[PDB]
Each structure stands twice: as C-alpha cells, then as structure tokens.
Ligand binder design. Structure first.
Ligand SMILES: CCCCCCCCOCCOCCOCCOCCO
Ligand SMILES: CCCCCCCCOCCOCCOCCOCCO
Ligand SMILES: CCCCCCCCOCCOCCOCCOCCO
Ligand SMILES: CCCCCCCCOCCOCCOCCOCCO
Length: 701
C-alpha cells in the first residue's frame, strides 16, 4: 500500500496545490514508514534523516528546545502543526504525528513571517474512516520504556473518533547518572460528515514532560588554554548537569476546530480555528561558561533558566480548488489568517544561605566547593543543591498578525505549469519589560507590514518528469520569537523600529518518478540568502546591513527499488558565507566582526548525507540499515569553535509473528560513535546519545 511507501507523492498541506513532482520547490517528507522503521520518538531525532538540517542549542537568552536550521537559517520561529504556526519552545514528540514535511528554501508566501531558509510542518494523525486499534509496547537499554495506543472507531454514519495515548521514559543512552526523560500524552479527535460535502473535525493534543535536562561538553583547546576549538577530550557520556538542581517541565495543549464545505465538487471553503497553550519551566547547566576552570580540571555549573507561559489563537480561512477556463487550468488556495499570542516570561534567582542573589551562579572561579557549584572535569559525581531557587518575572509579550494571500498553480498545457504566490502580512510585537537593577521599565513595540511572493515555471518533458526554475522571498520582523526563542529575533529598545530582515531563494531543479512510479529522484541547485540581515553597530544601535548566503545542491531518492528493497536517501552540499558581518557586543564593549567576512556560517555543514534502506530477507522478516553523515559544523562567526565530522549507523529487524503482531528490534548508533549534534556559538556543544537498543511488540487490528 501507499501508506507503506517511503515515497510521498502529495503534501498534506493544502497550500501546496500541486503534487510534489510538479512543485517548483524543494520539499522532503519524513514518511510514516520511515518513522515506523526508525522508531524515532522526537522531532529532533526524526530530523537526523534529513541531511543538512542542523540542530541549535540553548543558552542564557534562548530556550533549549527544538531549534532546527534549514539551509543555514533558523526555523525555530517557523514550526507548524498542520499548517498553523506553533513556535513556542518545545521538545516535540512523534506519537501523534503521521509525517513531517520539510520545506527547503524561502517560503513566506506560504507561511508569513519567517521561513527564511525553510520551515517544518508536522502533520497530525486524525480521526478517519475505517476501524482500527494499534499499539506498541517497548523496552530498551538505559531504562527506556514506551507504550503507545492508537484506536479509531468509525460509527458508520459519517462520524469517526480517534485517540492516541503515550507513556514514555528513557535515560539518555550512554550517559550514566545523566539526563532523563519522562512524558505522557493524549490526542483525541472526532470527525463528522465523512464522505459528504460538509465536514467538521474537533481535535485536542496534550503532552506533558518531567525531565532532568541535558548539559553539554565544554569547548577547550589545551595548546592555547582557552575555551575554543573542539569539545574537551573527556569520557564519552560525561554529564555536567546538576541533577538535584536542574529540571525541565513542558506542558502543551492544542485544541482545533476545522470546518469544511464543498461549494462545488471542485471548490472548498475551510475555516480552521486553533487554540494553543504552551508552558516551559527549566533550569539546566552550561558546562563552565568559558570561565577557564576546564584547564584546571574543574567545571562550574553555570545556571540557565526560564519560565514561560504562552497562549495563542489562530484562525485561517482558505478557499481552495480548481477552475478550468477552457484554456488555463487553475489550482488555487486563496485565504486570510489572524493570530494573537500572549506570553509571560520569568526565570530563577539563586539565593545562598547569606542572602546573596544571582541569576547565573556562585563560585564561578571554583574557589569554594562546599556548596557543590563546581564538579570534576573527569568523573563528575552528583551532589546536593543546597541553595534556593526563586521565580522572578521579567516581561510579557504580545504578537498579533493579519494576512491575506493568493496561491495559484496554472497549467498552461500539460507540459507547462506557472506557479504563483503573493502574500501580505501585518505584524505587531509588543513587549513590556519590568525594571531591572540597570534599567527602568519600558515597552518595546514593532509594527511591520510586508509583501512576499513566489514565482516558478515547471516544464514537464514527460508526465513523470519536471524541470523548474523558481524564485521566492521571505521577511523576518524583529520580535518574531514572540518573547522567548531564537535570540537573534529578540526585540529591545534599540531594534524595535528596524524594518524586517529580507531573504530570498533562487532555485533550479529537476524531479522524476521512475520504475512505474515506485521511485522518486529530486535534485536542486540554489542560492538561499539573507541579503538584508539585522546586525549590531554598537552596544545600543542596530541596522539591516548584514549579508549572508548559502549556495547549495540537494539530491533525494525515495521509494521501492524492488518489491523487497526500499530506500530513503539524501545528499547535500552547502557552501555558506558570512558575506558581511556587524559587531559582537557584550557588557558595553563591541568586537568588530568584519575581519570574519567570508567565513563559513555556523550551524551548517559543507556536506551531509543520509541513507535508510530495508530488505525483505524472508516473507516474515525485514532488515534495515542506516547511515547518517555530516561534515564539521562551526558554532561561531569567528569559526574557532566547532564539532567534527561524523558517521552514525543504525539497524533494524522486524519479524511478523502473525497478521496482527510484529516484533521489532532497533539498534541505534550501532558503532557507539561519540559525536555532537549541536554546537553553540560559545561555551559548549551537545553530545549525541550513545549506542542503544530497543525491542518492541507492535500490534495492529
Ligand atoms: C491571547 C490569545 C489567546 C486567546 C484565547 C485562546 C487561548 C487558548 O488557551 C488554551 C487553549 O487550549
Ligand atoms: C494578496 C496580497 C495583495 C498584495 C498587497 C499589496 C499592497 C502593498 O502593501 C504595502 C506593504 O509594504 C510595501 C510593499 O511593497 C509594495 C509592493 O506592492 C506590490 C503590489 O502587489
Ligand atoms: C518520452 C519523452 C522523452 C523524454 C526525454 C526527457 C529527457 C530528459 O531530460 C533531462 C532534463 O535534465
Ligand atoms: C526561466 C524559464 C524557466 C523554464 C523552466 C526551468 C528549466 C530550467 O531552466 C534554468 C536552467 O536550468 C538548467 C538545468 O537544466 C539542465 C538540463 O536539465
């Protein structure tokens, strides 16, 4: 069946009005079958299958959740759930996810603000026709246990209801007395009017976590005695967090009402209303914060924290369908959107027994260990936290947007398709800051309005082939993180009046369905760039004079090579350049970065590739193998802090016990490679999980 294919022909996003073969834009789909084969449980893990998507890390001024970079540009503020932005900081789960669609290239005409290098859209499982009950019970090394249940009941009168439930725990693999994850979720929905002209779907999503959060490995260069170079040479799986102090609790609720009416057999009006509540409460450890203790065999437990509470309402109204004038065939989506988000943000003060207060920590010089503020670089041991944390409010933030767009793919003849999109956005961000020890209370506000677009031509040499050229723009206003997120987007007194950043993608490509439509190959060559980047000029002045660009190549191959052999593979070459830099400022002092003009962009590898392939060795036995490769990744503009290249292997075996029951073994990071998945701009990098195994009993009725 098609549900079992690694090749996905159509996007579930109704803003992609044409099949992916004929769409003049790069789109990768992390398919249902790939998700099942790999047993990825988080978006972050899932993204490892897409080469060149690099993950970013948190620090003092930005949260430590999902931070995907696409073609060199952060998509943290451009993460979508069924086409609606939901970009509060979260570690997103896969339990209610059908597939993940990664748009690569500038895409504001489809998504509004952001989408500079691309965007991610997670497609949810929802109630549908046909009865079924599916489940998984699994156990794995390092105290992994996971149970999921997914039941769908078709009442046979156009009504169906579905619920997925999740219970999950694991320790980070290979990291003893280290990070720990626990979470529970539920996702019930009900749909009405199946197979009729008038339809309604009510859905709810809930996920709640209770974790001991990861730390990282500090950068160190022994020759220089400085916090730079590669991560310190310490034992694999070393944890520098402070388990008695550190924690992270996330809680997310999403409620959606979607109403559809078919005005004709070819034109549908849809209204989607989404209500989201998102909380994040955390304390985690930066290993040494570049204080130099590493060179004396010690690590200071620098504290990073935040407490956020966000509520968002979004409504999208879209008219979709097709109209054939006789000469031209239009495939369209025209619409309007409104959203409003409000966020409260605070963090933690640390108070010692004498009443001293800090937001960062005590004894950063490791002069006194009696309250356990530093640990051993080699063989750290977990100790009590004996100071006190106290919640402290910092600011609130309100983002309101309104937009209208037209998307139309015009078939001129069966060989010629003209793709068009045009969108107008109005954006307002307002942030009210409480007084601090160094500044009075103030309000920052940005108002931006901007038009973005896309234009492409697709030529089809045959019905199974496409060759295209396209151009698309993006705009990214200050304050886009809506209070807490990517720190490059944070609004303040001095940038609040600045116009949006401007980006664009020029792409040429080709796509082909082969082997009786069992295989799809894609190739693209592009320049994705931010030709107007916001940069700092001095400690209290900004301007839009920066520039960067990524010249790249992407190749993708998905589907069935034979009726026993399938494949999902990708390659990318990314030649990135920080063409024109501003200054780096800290505590009133700015360092000029023009000396780094021409450097490689951080958080992007020059090359990367992934491969997943499976073979039906017996009719009841499938075996899978994967490889993930990345070149080295820089953390900083100066290109002095980095993590090395790596290859990571995976394997799988699935045995069909009977028609309803499978046993599936996954071995992850099969060679137990020590590598790093995130490189922060300073201080540290995040180690990838070590080797693990998971064994599951999967059922399907
Ligand atoms: C200020 C924007 C919020 C408007 C009301 C909807 C908030 C949704 O709350 C949680 C939904 O679940
Ligand atoms: C479907 C949206 C229709 C496009 C609205 C155009 C209104 C222009 O708004 C001004 C926004 O800021 C300046 C943008 O530059 C003006 C370019 O005008 C393009 C006309 O299509
Ligand atoms: C049966 C029609 C012939 C199709 C020939 C297509 C040639 C391939 O073009 C490659 C584009 O690059
Ligand atoms: C600008 C007109 C767009 C026509 C459709 C796009 C065809 C690609 O034209 C741009 C150059 O493409 C070079 C790649 O093709 C090489 C052989 O295939």
């Amino acid at each position: 069946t098609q549900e079992e294919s690694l090749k996905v022909d159509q996007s579930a996003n109704s803003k992609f009005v044409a099949p992916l073969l004929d769409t003049p834009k790069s789109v990768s789909v992390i398919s249902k079958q790939l998700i099942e084969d790999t047993k990825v449980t988080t978006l972050a893990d899932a993204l490892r299958t897409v080469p060149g998507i690099t993950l970013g890390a948190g620090e003092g001024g930005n949260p430590n959740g999902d931070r995907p970079f696409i073609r060199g540009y952060s998509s943290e503020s451009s993460m979508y759930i069924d086409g609606i932005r939901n970009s509060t900081s979260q570690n997103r789960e896969m339990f209610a996810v059908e597939q993940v669609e990664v748009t690569k290239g500038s895409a504001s005409a489809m998504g509004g603000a952001g989408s500079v290098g691309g965007s991610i859209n997670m497609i949810s499982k929802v109630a549908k026709k046909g009865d079924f009950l599916e489940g998984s019970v699994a156990a794995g090394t390092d105290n992994y246990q996971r149970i999921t249940l997914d039941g769908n009941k078709d009442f046979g009168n156009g009504i169906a209801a579905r619920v997925a439930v999740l219970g999950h725990q694991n320790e980070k693999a290979g990291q003893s007395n280290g990070a720990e994850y626990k979470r529970v979720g539920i996702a019930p929905s009900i749909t009405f009017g199946l197979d009729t002209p008038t339809r309604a779907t009510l859905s709810y999503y809930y996920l709640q976590t209770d974790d001991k959060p990861d730390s990282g490995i500090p950068y160190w260069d022994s020759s220089l005695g400085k916090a730079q170079g590669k991560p310190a040479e310490v034992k694999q799986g070393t944890y520098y967090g402070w388990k008695d102090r550190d924690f992270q609790k996330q809680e997310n609720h999403i409620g959606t009402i979607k109403l559809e009416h078919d005005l004709t057999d070819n034109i549908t009006i849809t209204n989607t209303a989404m209500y989201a509540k998102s909380k994040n409460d955390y304390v985690w450890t930066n290993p040494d914060d570049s204080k130099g203790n590493v060179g004396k065999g010690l690590v200071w437990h620098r504290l990073n924290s935040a407490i956020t509470d966000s509520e968002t309402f979004t409504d999208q109204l879209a008219l979709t369908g097709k109209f054939d004038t006789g000469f031209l065939k239009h495939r369209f989506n025209v619409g309007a959107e409104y959203s409003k988000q409000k966020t409260d943000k605070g963090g933690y003060n640390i108070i010692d027994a004498k009443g001293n207060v800090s937001s960062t920590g005590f004894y950063s010089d490791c002069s006194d260990l009696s309250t356990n503020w530093c640990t051993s670089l080699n063989g750290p041991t977990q100790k009590p936290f004996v100071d006190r944390l106290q919640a402290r409010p910092d600011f609130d933030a309100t983002v309101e947007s309104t937009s209208v767009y037209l998307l139309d793919n015009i078939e001129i003849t069966p060989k010629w398709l003209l793709d068009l999109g045009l969108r107008w956005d109005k954006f307002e961000a307002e942030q009210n800051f409480l007084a601090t020890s160094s500044a009075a209370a103030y309000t920052a506000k940005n108002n931006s309005d901007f038009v973005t677009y896309q234009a492409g031509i697709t030529f089809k040499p045959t019905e199974n082939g496409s060759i295209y050229t396209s151009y698309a723009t993006s705009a990214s206003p200050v304050g886009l993180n809506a209070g807490w997120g990517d720190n490059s987007e944070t609004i303040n007194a001095n940038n609040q009046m600045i116009d949006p950043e401007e980006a664009q993608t020029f792409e040429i490509g080709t796509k082909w369905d082969f082997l009786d439509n069992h295989l799809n190959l894609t190739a693209a060559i592009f320049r994705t760039e931010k030709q107007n980047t916001r940069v700092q000029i001095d400690p209290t002045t900004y301007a839009n004079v920066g520039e960067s660009k990524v010249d790249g190549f992407e190749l993708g191959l998905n589907g069935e090579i034979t009726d026993k052999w399938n494949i999902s593979a990708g390659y990318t070459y990314l030649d990135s350049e920080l063409t024109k830099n501003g200054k780096s400022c800290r505590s009133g002092k700015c360092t000029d970065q023009s000396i780094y003009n021409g450097n490689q962009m951080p958080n992007v590898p020059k090359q990367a590739a992934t491969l997943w392939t499976t073979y039906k060795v017996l009719p009841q036995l499938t075996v899978g193998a994967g490889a993930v490769y990345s070149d080295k990744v820089y953390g900083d503009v100066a290109n002095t802090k980095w993590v090395p290249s790596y290859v990571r292997y995976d394997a799988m075996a699935r045995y069909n016990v009977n028609k309803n029951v499978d046993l599936q073994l996954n071995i992850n990071n099969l060679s137990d490679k020590r590598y790093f998945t995130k490189a922060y701009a300073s201080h540290y990098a995040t180690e990838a999980e070590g080797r693990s195994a998971v064994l599951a009993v999967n059922f399907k009725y």
